[PDB]
């Protein structure tokens, strides 16, 4: 299934 | 000049951290987009002014057939606007969640045009640096479509550095992972965690923690399906080599060692940019309003300064 993942930048 | 009047907003595509998606169409033309919209003041008050217009500038400045292109981009007092070309195919992610594998000729075939358009952006100098399969959207035909190019480096040629930490956690390469510099060959890398899920199913590397998912990165050694070919494993091993001067791709070559490896044989690099072969496969969509290939998740929801002085735009086709 993976969950869904969100990019970052810092 | 463009307005938010000039369009009809069918519904939800998605929904990302500073905005949403929407299915569009232009009032005078009867044409379908993809919208993205975003609210100026979320995007002031958290320091993404820089990463919105880079994605501006950069589509204004990109043209291939494997990535998403911009019609018109317009702002209004309260919120930025990009009408995209709209992918009927929903995402890459939506199709291996459904299916789970693919066989590893239709993972060739999707390989293939990221790496024609990895090749090409790096050749406009722009490092996209955000390849995963949330990212990897269908056209109507089945081509893969990039979008999202907020996190792009532009003006890095050769072997020239980044030093931002950004991208996303599962799919960051080891060298994103130690201190200081590094170059574009992160984005062979993560080419390579999606051809990794598209072949073997799942991530490469996996925790819910990011520390831990941070160490397996660095330091566990990727697993393979043993009935995998020698020509995968071997493509795997290499677009996944943690040093990037080791990894396939890391040269100064660039996309040409990726090409060049006995996995791509069968492809003619020439056929792959001017869309010659078959897909393996079509979005079977009835109509121009079809979201079959979108969550109902989001589908299903409703209808509600110089700083911004290289947004606008309109394309010429
Ligand atoms: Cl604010 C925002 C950012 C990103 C999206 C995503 C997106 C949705 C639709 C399209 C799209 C472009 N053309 N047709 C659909 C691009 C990106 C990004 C990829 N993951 C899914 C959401 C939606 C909203």
Redesign the pocket.
């Given at each position: 299934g993976r969950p869904?993942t969100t990019s970052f930048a810092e | 000049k463009v307005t938010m009047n000039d369009f009809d907003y069918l519904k939800l595509?998605?929904?990302?951290?500073?905005?949403?998606?929407i299915?569009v169409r232009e009032k005078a033309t009867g044409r379908y987009?993809?919208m993205?919209?975003?609210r100026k003041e979320v995007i002031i008050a958290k320091d993404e002014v820089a990463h919105t217009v880079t994605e501006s500038r950069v589509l204004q400045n990109t043209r291939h057939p494997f990535l998403?292109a911009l019609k018109y981009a317009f702002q209004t007092h309260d919120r930025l606007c990009f009408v995209?070309?709209?992918?009927?195919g929903?995402?890459l992610?939506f199709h291996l969640s459904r299916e789970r594998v693919f066989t590893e000729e239709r993972a060739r075939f999707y390989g293939a045009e990221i790496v024609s358009a990895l090749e090409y952006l790096h050749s406009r100098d722009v490092v996209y640096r955000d390849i995963k399969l949330?990212?990897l959207?269908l056209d109507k035909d089945g081509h893969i479509?990039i979008?999202?190019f907020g996190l792009c480096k532009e003006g890095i040629s050769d072997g020239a550095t980044m030093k931002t930490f950004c991208g996303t956690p599962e799919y960051l390469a080891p060298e994103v992972l130690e201190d200081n510099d590094y170059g574009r060959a992160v984005d062979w890398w993560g080419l390579g965690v999606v051809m990794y899920e598209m072949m073997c199913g799942r991530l490469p590397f996996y925790n819910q923690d990011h520390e831990r998912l941070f160490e397996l990165i660095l330091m566990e050694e990727i697993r393979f399906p043993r009935t995998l070919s020698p020509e995968a494993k071997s493509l795997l091993a290499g677009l996944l080599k943690k040093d990037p001067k080791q990894r396939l791709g890391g040269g100064p070559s660039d996309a040409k060692e990726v090409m060049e490896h006995r996995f791509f044989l069968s492809i003619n690099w020439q056929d792959v940019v001017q869309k010659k072969l078959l897909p393996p496969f079509k979005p079977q969509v009835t109509s121009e309003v079809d979201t079959r290939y979108?969550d109902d998740e989001?589908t299903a929801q409703s209808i509600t300064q110089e700083m911004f002085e290289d947004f606008d735009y309109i394309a010429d086709w």
């Open positions: 869904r | 595509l998605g929904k990302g951290t500073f905005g949403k998606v299915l987009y993809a993205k919209i975003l998403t995209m070309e709209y992918a009927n929903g995402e992610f949330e990212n959207m479509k979008t999202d979108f989001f």
